Each structure stands twice: as structure tokens, then as C-alpha cells.
Ligand binder design. Sequence first.
Ligand SMILES: Nc1nc2c(ncn2[C@@H]2O[C@H](COP(=O)(O)OP(=O)(O)OP(=O)(O)O)[C@@H](O)[C@H]2O)c(=O)[nH]1
Ligand SMILES: Nc1nc2c(ncn2[C@@H]2O[C@H](COP(=O)(O)OP(=O)(O)OP(=O)(O)O)[C@@H](O)[C@H]2O)c(=O)[nH]1
Ligand SMILES: Nc1nc2c(ncn2[C@@H]2O[C@H](COP(=O)(O)OP(=O)(O)O)[C@@H](O)[C@H]2O)c(=O)[nH]1
Ligand SMILES: Nc1nc2c(ncn2[C@@H]2O[C@H](COP(=O)(O)OP(=O)(O)O)[C@@H](O)[C@H]2O)c(=O)[nH]1
Ligand SMILES: [Mg+2]
Ligand SMILES: [Mg+2]
Lengths: 89, 426, 426, 153, 380, 437
Amino acid sequence: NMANCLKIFQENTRRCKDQLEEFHCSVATAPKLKPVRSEGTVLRTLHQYYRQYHPLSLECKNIKKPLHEPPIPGWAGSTRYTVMARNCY
Amino acid sequence: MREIVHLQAGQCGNQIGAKFWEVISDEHGIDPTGTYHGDSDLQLERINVYYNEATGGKYVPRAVLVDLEPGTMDSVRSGPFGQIFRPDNFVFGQSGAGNNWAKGHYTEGAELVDSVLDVVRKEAESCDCLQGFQLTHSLGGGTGSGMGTLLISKIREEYPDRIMNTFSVVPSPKVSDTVVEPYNATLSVHQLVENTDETYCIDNEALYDICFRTLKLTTPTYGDLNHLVSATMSGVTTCLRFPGQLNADLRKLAVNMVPFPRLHFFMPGFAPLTSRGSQQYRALTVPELTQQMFDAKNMMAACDPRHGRYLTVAAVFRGRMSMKEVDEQMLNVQNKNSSYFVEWIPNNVKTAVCDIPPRGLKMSATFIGNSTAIQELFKRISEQFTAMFRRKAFLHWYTGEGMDEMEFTEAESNMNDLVSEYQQYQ
Amino acid sequence: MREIVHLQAGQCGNQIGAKFWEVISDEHGIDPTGTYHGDSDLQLERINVYYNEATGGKYVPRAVLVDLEPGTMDSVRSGPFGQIFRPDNFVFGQSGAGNNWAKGHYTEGAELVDSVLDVVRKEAESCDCLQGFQLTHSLGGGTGSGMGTLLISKIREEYPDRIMNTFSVVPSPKVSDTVVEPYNATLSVHQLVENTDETYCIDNEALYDICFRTLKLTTPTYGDLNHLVSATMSGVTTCLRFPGQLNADLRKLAVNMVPFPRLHFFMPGFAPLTSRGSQQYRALTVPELTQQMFDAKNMMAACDPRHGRYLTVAAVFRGRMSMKEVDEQMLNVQNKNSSYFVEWIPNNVKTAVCDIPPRGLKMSATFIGNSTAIQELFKRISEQFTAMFRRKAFLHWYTGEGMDEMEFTEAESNMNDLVSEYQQYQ
Amino acid sequence: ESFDTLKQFLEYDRKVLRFFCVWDDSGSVFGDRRELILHYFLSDDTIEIKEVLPHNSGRDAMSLFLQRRKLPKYGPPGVYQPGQLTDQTVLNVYYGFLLDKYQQEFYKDTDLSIGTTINVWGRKVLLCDCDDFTKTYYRTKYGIENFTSIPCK
Amino acid sequence: RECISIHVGQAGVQIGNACWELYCLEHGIQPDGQMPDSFNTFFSETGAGKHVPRAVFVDVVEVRTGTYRQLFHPEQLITGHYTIGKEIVDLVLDRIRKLADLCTGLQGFLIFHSFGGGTGSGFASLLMERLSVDYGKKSKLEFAIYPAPQVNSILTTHTTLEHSDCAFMVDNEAIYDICRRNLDIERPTYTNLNRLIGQIVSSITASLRFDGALNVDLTEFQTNLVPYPRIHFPLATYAPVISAEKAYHEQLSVAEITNACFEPANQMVKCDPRHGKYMACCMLYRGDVVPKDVNAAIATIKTKRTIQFVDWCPTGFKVGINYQPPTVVPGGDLAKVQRAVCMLSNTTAIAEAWARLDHKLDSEAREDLAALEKDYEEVG
Amino acid sequence: RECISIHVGQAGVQIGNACWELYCLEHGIQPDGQMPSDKTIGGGDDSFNTFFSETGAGKHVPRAVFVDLEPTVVDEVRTGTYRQLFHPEQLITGKEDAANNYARGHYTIGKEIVDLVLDRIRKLADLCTGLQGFLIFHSFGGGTGSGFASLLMERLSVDYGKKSKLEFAIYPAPQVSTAVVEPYNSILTTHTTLEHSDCAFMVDNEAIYDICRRNLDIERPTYTNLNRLIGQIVSSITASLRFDGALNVDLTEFQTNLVPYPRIHFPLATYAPVISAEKAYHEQLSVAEITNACFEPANQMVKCDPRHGKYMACCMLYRGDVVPKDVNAAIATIKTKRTIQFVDWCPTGFKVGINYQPPTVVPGGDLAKVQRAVCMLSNTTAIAEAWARLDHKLDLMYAKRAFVHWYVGEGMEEGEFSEAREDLAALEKDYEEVGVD
Ligand SMILES: Nc1nc2c(ncn2[C@@H]2O[C@H](COP(=O)(O)OP(=O)(O)OP(=O)(O)O)[C@@H](O)[C@H]2O)c(=O)[nH]1
Ligand SMILES: Nc1nc2c(ncn2[C@@H]2O[C@H](COP(=O)(O)OP(=O)(O)OP(=O)(O)O)[C@@H](O)[C@H]2O)c(=O)[nH]1
Ligand SMILES: Nc1nc2c(ncn2[C@@H]2O[C@H](COP(=O)(O)OP(=O)(O)O)[C@@H](O)[C@H]2O)c(=O)[nH]1
Ligand SMILES: Nc1nc2c(ncn2[C@@H]2O[C@H](COP(=O)(O)OP(=O)(O)O)[C@@H](O)[C@H]2O)c(=O)[nH]1
Ligand SMILES: [Mg+2]
Ligand SMILES: [Mg+2]
């Protein structure tokens, strides 16, 4: 009874330490990546990344609201206000 | 066989416990997942004094994490060893305390103390033979002083016999972090002295000067502060977990420092502290460890011990050691420091030796000292209470929860009685 | 050889059957086409208690499901286990129940309850030694309290000595779901209490709160409300079908539980209720079941025994376990918390240990217990019935269904005497 | 030694390389197949991982799994002695310092690629996907193409 | 299962237009009638495939030659108290008996009308006592429409009040001011003012329409919300109404989608029940409504003393759940929401509106309404 | 946790216009109002829960009130760039102005929209689960920024009560002026909020023009330049509720650390890194230097000299990379300078909070990109002489009773001005009642 529990625990700890050592060897084995295209040119296409997908960063231009678009609830000057104001414009 | 229930109150106590439970995780070889990854069988043999065994081979720390607001529970849980505490051991409110005493003591602490007792007494019911209660809290906080001190009041009305030690964080002498620290400190000293068998007080000034003077760090982060105290708490409970030549449990020290029930205020320490650059150029022996224990510039806790007089000294050595050097160096530290000891006790220094040093060290030890130089710690707090209560500075927001001024004068009077009781040995 | 004929009343009964016969189907290892798939063979031995066996390897449950509206029946056949139920056993009405128990047997239910007498004593004679019937209905609805209560009453003539049973869905304390619960629940207790002897008590919020805090689901549904009642629904009758080393039927749980036929109202629970994120932190041992059984957060009823006193307790265990520790903790709970226990009875609690745990578990327990704290339920419904009957508010229906004002006073008087009976053992 | 931090902070302030991760666990008794969201911060070479709870709320919600410091590659290290984790040693003082001259590994972006398994303090988590910003960063910096999704969950 | 719908007057045919638009658009009913088991309770099963509607239109009757000429059976659609009812009421009873003879079991009987119409109130006050002498104690429903104050009213109260199980109170101006502060339908029309009450008549028969978890039928709220057999004239509000964009901005959960019914700004009639007393209520739910969050919402209202319950109703609540979200009409104004709440309640706060009607009017109807006023004061 | 802030007046809603972009930039919440699907921020998963609401569709709606009775600025706010992010009903629009009158916005034009504003705030608060308090964004010298804000403040305590009410107020400049009747509607709006406010912060106009002139290098600036700085300091005051750090401060900790009494609750506010990108990288922004900069009088956002007063409470709210050693090392030499005078009853005098989030910058905006930030909340008795000048102007002008006929014709009583003057006399007297040593 006690011997079975102790033997099971010894086998369990030994297996777990074995998998941990195998993981450590695998991290020691796995290859690394080296840079093609330099540091001074990855930032350039990152700069172009932030100017054709997300232009709002690095802009703060605050463009005006276009004239083909209906106003928020109401400030003055049937259907709902969205559709009615689309008909009005 | 003698298991310890840890109490973890506040934001301070939460971080201190969150890293004490990792210096006690590498000792017993507990991984972040919760499985035994140990090196020998000594830790496996008596891993019950801090850890509970779960059904799938997982090990679960046995401690209660309590704070009003959940902004600190998301920091302890997300840590490196944050996924081994129970979901049910994180008890929480909805609001915070915020540098106040009454909010954690009467009008909101009473609601959630009944929610922390339901897990504390459940936790003790799974214990085989409980030894006592360790608590980590801040004296200058709102939840450590508010809720944790309520727990000091509440648990020992149910278990009166068991031991009680607190790792308390006193306000710093030179620079403090909260304008109403002295109010909470004076209100907590009185309930501390009437309810705790022993007190391990830590100051951040005495950690910072060690990380400057001895450890020689350039940018000491707060984990570097909390490691010294976590090593201190791990090094006072050596003998319950490992065999040794002469083993001492918490009762065996508490019978050895306190002669009087109101003289239980201490001065922790830690011997093997070396710099990064000076690690291999220092001989690590008993004389150079005992030359680090009994100095003031390399000392933890708080005030200068040369301005007072020690009553007693405890020392818990770990590692294979020669007891003749132990006795010889303790006798010489009594003999050369004859002017700094009482004359009405023959032997003041206690000796306790366990066999196992921690990882990366060959021998280690922990200093514990009762002295009358702790009188100076409360002198400045009482001075601040007298200098701020005269104008009734923050008085109306303690009366904003139904509390009167009579208990404030009672706390000041009890602090004065305590600080005059230590005085008669000079 | 000991066969159970199953009668469910109302949409409540149909839809609690839709999950009880899911739990039974999982524990006896059958599939939604009715045949056998399970791993072991001892489950196939005593299938005859619940499943009627037909030619062609089919196990029809002995479940007769009655209702006054066919859409919930079509929803029952629309479930994952809607195939294994026979189509002949479904009894269907034409008009609604009107949130009253009158017309489910008087006007439209006369011919319909004549029709169920061709399925009650047909399915009974196919067995050999019918162990008993059992029911589950709702006291806040009309058809469950109409057909189910009279089928409780009508079945007493043909088979008196055979044990009957019911699981009563008492109305919700805080958020009521129907205004007729002062009538339709109280009117089934004055004379439909002597017909039954094993009345349990399952409450809607009493599953809500425990599913919130114990299982920790942000979005609970009725699919686990039915699971939590079905686990007790099958755990009461486990030794009937599964051999063990201490076998004890439901008649056992009747004899060893109640001293008088009037005092037979129970208060159940189920102990392995751990959150899915707290499975790996809880040591599934014998003491942690009987710890959780004696708590208000694992109580499947509205009332609280801390306000009352434990009269008798029952516990039915599973799994190959050793019975030293259950009796050790059992002697522990009779002695430490001795204030919440009733004198004039030497030992109060019955144990029943079988060998087979439910699939995926190793040990569990089922709770049955009467008390004087269930007085809190019937008084809280009686005060709301007496707070509205004095204004003669709802009598216009009841004048037109052949019920006069004598049986109203009869209902109030039976409530009064059953309440006053439960006051002496306080 | 390059002990300045303003380089990687100014030019890499708001760049986060996301990776979708999956931690399979059938060996343990009550482990669940918990998937994770990885965040590598190029600002200070730190790394935090996030949890996404599935439907019906199987577990509790903390919104954080690991905090804002660097991931060790060689498993969980035993904790060092106090003072051993400093970045630069120093001679004996004089409040000032006089530094020394005659005197640890961490995961970096060069190791995270689609198809590898990494060591988050002992766990067997597997990188499966990335977002389009991470695809662009690897396409430019390391020439990696065909960021094929690994079919999991 | 087979339900019926009767609608009286110009108001009746106009509200039946939008109500049957909702009914025909939940199912795959295109205006020809065919398909590309939820349909049988309002439509028949004809072997040719054209589903005959189970509806009777009595009386604008545009609806004949508009978008749906072939969907409506022209024999069922018929073209006011003592003269005109002699050749219509006994004739439309023939068609009612024709439709009832093919149904297996009839359960619903739904009559809609307008109080201000000669035909609309006269046939309303003819059909229900002709109903009493041919059908008996079967349930009948009345969701009446009468214009709000400040913008034949008593002639029908002495003959319909005693012989009606339920009667709502739909006021046109009271929906006119209910959207302009919430929606932005500036200058609301009339041909789609019945779209909202079309949504409510969709919600009242939801369990008859769709399957449910805790669902309840048409016969129950005329046996649950009625205290007394002569007085039961409740109200009905459908507060959770918004357009698509406010359905996109704010998050809709069950708790704060029911508070709008209890507040007077979305109370469907103008008379706020702060003066009155909440007698009892009725939850008719639909969509992704969970049984947990509802019972975490009524408990917050119950512990509030701003509301006032009557003394004799301790429970005072009623719950019915339906699976499907409401169906949004193309060309309508509803948002494709995932949850909605339908309200049924009777209050004492109707009595002050009828005292307003009393002193605005100011012979047997007069004394009967005065006695009704006194009885409603004594009850609450 | 939750937080709800209230902007009153065109000053308040313009502060929201030029401040809530920083709330949209702390997280990655777009001006459209969604989380971008390929670019991520990496700030946890609930750091947006306090200031923005989550909708199951995915879009994020804020928790704030922009109320104005005059349309010309709130209409610009809605019609501008954030036309979809803001909830439409959360932007309350009026139809007429106040014309620098407290009386109209407090009684006559007030009461017919305060009920709807109360409805909006009650709905928004009942949406929230862990609401911590209120923040007030309104002016003093205006009419609708004074009267409507005062009526909202006097209506708030009736409903909720004990929830904290923080104030961020705009004060008339000592040297220059915008309107002519500003002492009147100033002391009329500090008379009723005094019993309702908890810690009233203070913002001047010319005192931030000095900051934007000499530290930051802008000649001839406008309101948006200072509005961005105000937005920076209010976001840094709520920094620790949203992100994690060593020492954490929430909205219940400022009250317990700044004001000792209910009658002296007017601290001062200062933000230290106010340099631009041309000089941020030409000098080292050390923690010692940015700690020394906050105690220089030239950094103050209110035109007053604190050397003539006694410091009462301070509240450090640090940010980014901060070593806790140098914080104590800088505060320890803060006590060493005898030129900074301290009072005797506050021996500690400092509260420190650390966050691990760097101070963000609007991209291409005005300020620089730095790693450290200081939020100074200096409670001092030097705010009394900023009130003695307003009292002096009131005494000089009230003796001729100028412009009172505008107020008395809309619900005012002429005796209420004397009551407000005596209340401010008490508010002036109690400041020297604590100046005794
Ligand atoms: N809410 C609502 N009200 C309606 C609707 N259609 C009509 N009504 C109201 O009901 C009234 C119906 O008109 P009637 O009162 O019958 O007048 P009529 O059509 O000339 O009928 P007679 O006077 O008998 O000839 C109108 O005045 C409307 O106010 C509708 O679709 N919805
Ligand atoms: N510092 C600062 N002050 C502002 C800003 N915007 C407006 N103000 C203040 O507003 C004052 C001008 O009065 P207003 O606020 O426009 O008056 P109002 O609120 O519209 O009240 P009425 O004119 O009566 O409608 C100036 O004295 C400024 O102090 C701002 O962006 N920054
Ligand atoms: N030793 C130690 N002190 C701490 C820690 N965290 C905070 N403190 C100190 O505790 C004081 C603040 O405590 P406080 O935030 O009020 O705790 P709270 O009551 O939980 O909120 C400061 O003076 C800190 O120096 C810790 O982890 N260890
Ligand atoms: N406890 C419990 N209650 C249920 C369940 N299913 C339905 N109910 C309750 O049944 C009540 C209404 O059902 P009821 O009217 O009795 O259905 P009926 O039997 O057809 O009349 C509601 O309050 C529900 O909460 C269940 O599985 N468990
Ligand atoms: Mg008409
Ligand atoms: Mg304005």
C-alpha cells in the first residue's frame, strides 16, 4: 500500500523531470532568425504601413464632415432622422 | 505535522505574501504549475506545514488573501507563482479602504470579516495539528490596519491557545508614503499589543539602506526589498520543515524571547548578504555570519540598537555546522557587548540549528531580537499623534463612521503606557 | 425485480424528466436510440428498476409524462433525448390550466385522468414487484398541481402500502413567478399531505445562488438547474440498482428519517459542487463531502437551519470507500456544533454505502433531511396567503368551480396545525 | 554595454507583436485546453500573455495571465540570492557609486515563429497564428513568408 | 392549435394590416401565400398551398387592392348598434362558424376596435354579446383604442365593461409624444403608428407563436391579471423601442431593458402610476433572455419605496419566456435587437383619467361610471 | 471599477473635445469607436472598462456628459470628427444661452432640462457596476457654466449623496479678463457648491499661458493648447485605476490624503514634463529634476506664489519607468530645502502613487514623447489670496450695485448676494484659522 504509493510518486516525478529536460534541450536546439533587410528599411515600410491602413495615427488633421451624410439626432439647420436627412441632403 | 496558516491582508501584505510564497516554493521545489520538481526527498517528506496536497498530485498553498478592492488581486494572480492559489482564497469587496481606519474596522470590515472567517475556519478544519497564525499586513494602510487587525481580534476569540506572530510594516522615520500614517499606526499599536504573542516589525528605510549599503544595488526594485523579508520569514520556520541537530518551533522561540506578555516587540535580521561583485571574495563561515548579525549598519527592522539595551536574542542557523563555534561566537558576542545587554539574565542568546541551508548557500541564519531600542520606533509616531491631534487634523472623517474621540485618547494613552513600560531597563 | 413507475406532472415534470433521464442514461450508459453502449456490464444488470425492456433491444423508461398543453410535449420530443420516450405514455390536454389546479381534473381533466388510468395500471402490471411511484411537479402552476396532486390522491386507493414520493417545487422567496402561488401552492398542502410521506423541497432561487457562487457560471441556465436536482433525483435511489456493502432503498430513507406521518418534509443537497476552475485545487476526500453537506450554500431549499434545529439527517454514499472516516467526521459534527441539533433522539443520521460512483467521479453523497427550520417556508407563504384572502380578492374563479368557503378555512386550519406541530421541537 | 533604453522606447513605442497560442492539456487530471493571446513588446523586450474565456464561463475572469517582464527560456529558474539580478556591478561606494569594469537569457522576437512551442514557466504552449502587423514585421525583418494558420480549436 | 383575430372599423382594418404584416413576415409568407409548423395557429393548411389567414375584418377596406390582394380571402373580409348590425353580425357569425368548424381546438378570440367609431364601437358592442350566446365562457380578448385626452365614448361602457375579460387602453397621442423624445420620427404618420401596437400584439401571442422554456399561452393573462370578474381594464407598454444606431451604441442587457417600462417616460398611456398603485404585472420576454438576469432585476425594483404596491399583492408578478427575437419589418422602424420585454399591468391610475373623462363629459352609463369610479377608489 | 465625468458649459465640452482624444489614445479606441483588428495596444483586457462601455457588437461608447444650453459649440462637438463615438443622448443640447447670468441657468432656463440630464446620468450610473465618483468640468465666469453646474451639483447630493464629487474649475485671471461680471457669477457658484464639493481643483488661464510660453515654446497660443495639458493631467489623476503599478491610488484615496477638513478643500494642480520634442532629448528628464520642477513656483497652473503660504498636502501620481529609490531620495531633499515652508500638523505631507504606463502623446501634437510623468496635487493655503482679489473686486463694484437688475429680474432675491459674501467671508476666515502655529 505505502510501497505502491511511493513507487508511483517516484515514477511520476522522474517522468516529469524527463519531459522538462527534453523541453530545455529543444529550446536549446531550435533555430533563430537573422535579419534580411536592414534596420533602416524596416522602419520605412512600417512608416508606410501607418499611412495607408491607419492614417488617423500621426495625422490629427480633423477633417470636416462630408455633405452627403445625415446629422446626429438634431441641432437644427416622415421616417427616421437618418433617412429623412439623407433625403434632405 | 504542525501546519501554519498564513494571513495576507492589504496591498502590502498581498505583495509580501505573493513573493514569500515563491521563496518557499523553490525551497520545496514547487513549479508555477503546482507539481513537485524537487532535488532531494527532504522537502517531500514534510511538505504539509505550508502546502496542501490536491487530488491530482497538485500542491496548493494554504493561505488567505484578503483586500477590499480587486486591483491588487489581479497582480498576485498574474505573477510567476500566481496560478497555484485557490480561486476561493481570493476574498474581495467592491470598494477600497484608502488610508483610513474606520472603513475597514466598523462600517465595512464587519460585512466581509464574516466572509473571510468562512474560509479561515474551513482551512483549519482540513489541518491535522495546527500550530498558529502568521499574518502579513501594513500598519499604515487601510486594509492591513482596518481588516487584518479585525482578524487579529476575531480569530483568537475562537482559538485562544495557538501562537500569533505578525510581520508588520511600521511607518518610515524619514520619508513616508501617506499623510495619515500616524493615525492608523497609533490606532493599530494598542490592538496589536493586547492580542499578538509576538511582532516582527519591518521598515522600508531599514531595507533600503541595506540594498544601498550591503547589497549595493543601483536601481533596487521593490522585489529586491521584499526578498529580504521573505527570506526572514522562511528562516524563522526552519525547524518545522527539515531535520536538524537542535530544532526549535515557533512555541520554542515564543517561550524564549518574552518574559512579560506586553514585551513582545522584535528586530529581525538575516546573515548571508553579499554584493554581486563581492560574492566570491568573502569567506562564508560562522565568524563572518555572526559579524553580520550583530551590527547596526547591516541591520533590518528599524532603529539603532546601540541606543537601547537588548533583553534577548534568537538565532536560527541552517546547515551542517560545528556547535562549538556557535557557542564560542555567541559567548564572545555576549562578552564583548557586555555594555549592551541586561545584567539580570545570565544567557540571552537562543540557539537553534537545522540541517538544510537554502539554494545557492552553504549556511544561513535569521536574527530575532527583543530590545528596548524599539522604544524609539513609537516615540516619533506618538510625537506625530500629539503634533497633529492638537489641531484635530483629520478627525472628522473618523467621526464620519460613528466613532468618537475617546478611543483616540485611549490609543494614545495605551501607547504611552507601553512606551513607558520599556523605559525602566535603562 | 423492484420496478419504479415514474409519473411527471406538468411542463415542469416533463422538463425535469428531460434531464433526469439524461443523468440516468449517462450513468447506465445508454444512447439516444435506446440501446446499450457503455463500458461495463454491471450497469446492465439492474436496469429493470427504471427502464422497461422491449423486444428488439430497447429500453423504454417507465416514465409517464402528463400535461394539459401539447407544445411542451412536442418540445420534449424535440430534445436530444426526445426519442427514447415512448409516444403512448404522453398524456396531452386540450385547454390550458389557467394557473389553477381546478380544471386540470374537474372539467377537462376528468376524461384525461380516466385516460391515464390506462397507462398507470397497464405499466404497473408489466412489472413483477413494483417498488413505488414518485412525482415531481410545481406548486406555482395549474396543471402540475391539478393533475399531479390528484394523481397523488387517486393512486392511494389501488396501491396503498406501496411507497409514494414527490419532489415539491415550492415558490420562489424573493422574485415570485406567478401571483397564484398564495393559492395554488397552499391549496395542495391541507389534504395532499397525508397522501405523501417523502416530500422533498426544491426551490428556484436555492439553485440560483449556489450555481452563482459554487459552480461560478456567469450565465447560468435551466440546463444545470435541472442537473443539480437530477443528481439528487438519482442519488437517492442508488443502492436500489447498484450493489454495495451497505444497501438501503428509498423506503429505508423513509423509515430512518421521520417519526410521524405529518412530519415528513425534507431539505436536500448534493456535496461534490466544485467550480470548473476549482477542480484542480480541491482534495476530493471523504471529510470534504460531509463538510459541504452541512452548509447553507449547498442547500437546495429556501430555509436556513442556523435559524432552526436539525431533527434527522440522511446520507447516501457512493464509490468503493472505507467507512471509518465517514463515521469519524460524523461523530465530529454531532459534537462540535451541538447547538444546532435536537435532543430526545440518540443518533439522528443514517448512512448507506454503495460501490459504484457516478461516471467521472469517485465519491459523492446524497442529502435528505427534515428540520424545524422549514417552518420558515410555510409561514412565509401563509402570511402572504392570509394577507390577501381577507380582502376576498380572487374568489370569483373559485365560486365557479364547485369549491366553497369551508375548505378555505380547512386549508388555513391545516396550515395552522402543521405549523404549531413544528414549533414544539424548536 | 548598451544600457540605454530610449532607443527601443522612442522608435518602438507602440508596436506589439501578437501571437495566438494554445495550451493543450490532457495529461493532467483537470486541465482544460486553454488558448492564450501573446503580446511581445518591442519597447523594452517584455512579454505578457492574456487569457480569453470561452462561452458559458468555464472559469473565473482575471484578464491577465502573465505580467510585464521578460520570459525566461530555460524553464523556471530557482530564485537567485538578493542582489544577484543587478544589471551592473559596482565597487565600494565612496551616497554615490564607483562602478566596476572587470565583470541570464531571455526570449526575443527571433525565437517566436509560427510553428514553434515556447516555455511560459514550464507550460507546453504552441504558437498558432498572428495578426497582419506581425506578418508585415516578419516579412520585412526576417523574410518569412507563408504564415499558415495551425489548425487548433 | 388555432388562434383567431377579429378587427372592427377603419382602425381595426388599419391595425390588422400591420399586425398581419408582422405575422406574415415572421413566417415565409410572401403576398401570394405559398412557401419557399409555426404557421398553423394563424393560417390554414390548404392542399393547393395558399395559406388562408385566420382573420375576420369588419367595417380604406386600399387594403383590398394593394400589396396583398390575393393573400386575404375576400369572403372572410366583410364590408352601427341597431340598424346596420342586423345584416352583418348574423352574416359574419356564419363565417366565424365556417372557420371554427375546421379548427381542431380554438383557444384565442381576439377582437380589436375603436371607441370613437360608429361602426367601430357599435359592432364592438354587438359582437361580444352575440359571442356570449353562441360560444359561452370561452376566452375573449379586447385591446381597445380610444384617443388620449387634451386632443359613444360612454355609450359602450355600459354594455362591454361587464362582458369583457380584458381591455387595454391604447391612446394615439400617447404614442405620438412617446417617440419624439426617444426616436426621431418627426411628424409621425398614421399608417405606421399601428406598427408599434403590431409589435405588442406580436409579443402577446409569442408562446402561441414560438416554442419556449417557461412559456405561457393566451388564456392565462385573462386568468392571472384579473382580480375581479367585472373590473379588469389593464394597460400594456412596450418600452424597449429604439432605432438601429442606438441599438448599436448602447449595450442592451435584460436588467436595464425592463426599467424603461417602470419609468413614466416610456409608459404607454399618459397617466403615470405614481398616483396609482401597481396591482400586478406580467413579464412577456423574447430573444436571448436568460432566467438569471431577469430575477436579478425585479429584486432591485422590489426593494425600492419610490414604487408603491397594493397591500393585498405580495407576489404581484408573472413571468413568460419566448425563444425568438422579434422580427423586424423591412420598411419599418424597428432595430434588429436581440432582446425585448412586453408589459401587461392594471393600475388604479386609470381611474383619474376616467375622472377626467367624467368632468369633461359633465344617463345609465353616467351613474354606472360614477359607481365604477367609487369601486375603483375603494379597491385601491 | 467605473468613473463618470461631467462637462458643463462650452468650456467643459471644449475641454472634453480636446481631452477625450487622449482617453481614446491611452487605449486604442478609434475616433470611429472600435478596436482595430490588426494593430493592438497591449494594455491588459479591462483597462478600458472604467472610461468606456463595451457593446457586444464590438463598438465602444464613453461614459460622460457634455451639457450646454447654447448650441454653437456642442453642435460643433457632435458634427466634428467624433460624430459616431459619442452617444447621441449623452450630448445634451439646449436652445438658448445664459448671457453671463447665474439666475437664468439656476431657476428659469435650468429646470426644464435638468430633469432630462438627471435621467441621463441616472441611466448611465445604473449601467455602471463599480462607480467610484464624479468629476466636474465647468467654468466660473460664464452663465451656463456657473448656474447649470451649480444646479446640477445641488441636485446631485439629493439623489446619490455619499459618492465623491471632484471639481476641475476654471477661474478668472488676475491680470486679464474675458467678461465684466465674472466676480458676481463666480462667488454665486462657489456659494452653493461649497457644501457639495469634496476637493475642488483649480485652473487659471494666464497661468497656463506662461507654461505654454516659457517651458513649452509657443507664442500666441489658443485654448486648445492648454486644453490638451488639462486633459493630460486629468488622465494622469486617474492613471492608477486603469493600469497597474507598485503603489496604487484610486478616487477614494485623494479625499483621504488631500483635505483635512470639509471647509478647506481647494488644492492646486501642476504637471511637470511640459517640454516639447525639440528640448526633451537635449536634456535628461531625470526623476530628481522633474520632482524639483513641481515645487518651483513658475510651474504652477494657478497664478499665485506658494512661498507665501504653508503646504498642507501633496499627492504624487507617478508614471512610466520610476525607481522607488529616487522618489524617496527626491522627497528627502524636498524636506531639506528650508525655502519650502511647511505647517506643523502634517508631519508626512506626501502621498506617492506609481504607475507602469508611459505618458502618451497625441501624435504630431504639442508635447514630446517621454518616459516619466508627475501629477502634482498641491493642497496649500496660498489659494486664499487668489480669493481676496475676487472679494476686493466684489466689494468695489457692489457698493454701486452694478448690473444687479439683470439677476433680480429672473428669480433672484437681492439678499442672497449678502449671504454668499458672508459665506465667502467664512471661507476666507477659516484659512487663517489654521495658520496659527
Ligand atoms: N392607434 C391607431 N388609431 C387608429 C388607427 N386607425 C384609426 N384610428 C383611430 O380610430 C378612429 C377611426 O375612425 P372612426 O372613428 O371609425 O371614424 P369613421 O371612419 O368615419 O367611422 P364612422 O364615424 O362610424 O363612419 C380615428 O379617428 C382614429 O383616431 C390606427 O391604425 N391606429
Ligand atoms: N482656461 C480655459 N478657459 C476657458 C476655456 N473655454 C472657455 N473658458 C472660459 O470661459 C470664459 C468665457 O465665458 P463662457 O464660459 O464662454 O460663458 P458661458 O459658459 O457660455 O455662459 P454664457 O455666455 O452666459 O452662456 C472665459 O473667461 C474662460 O475663462 C478653455 O478652453 N480654457
Ligand atoms: N514592505 C512592503 N511595504 C509595502 C508594500 N506595498 C506597499 N507598501 C507600503 O505600504 C504603504 C502603503 O500601503 P497601502 O497602499 O495603504 O496598503 P492598503 O491598505 O492595502 O491600500 C506605503 O508606505 C508602502 O511603502 C510591500 O509589498 N511590501
Ligand atoms: N426548480 C425548478 N423550477 C422550474 C423548472 N422548470 C420550470 N420551473 C419553474 O416553474 C414555474 C412555472 O412553471 P409552471 O407554471 O408550474 O408550469 P406548469 O406545470 O405547466 O403549470 C416557474 O417559476 C419556473 O421557475 C426546473 O427545472 N426547476
Ligand atoms: Mg367608425
Ligand atoms: Mg454654451
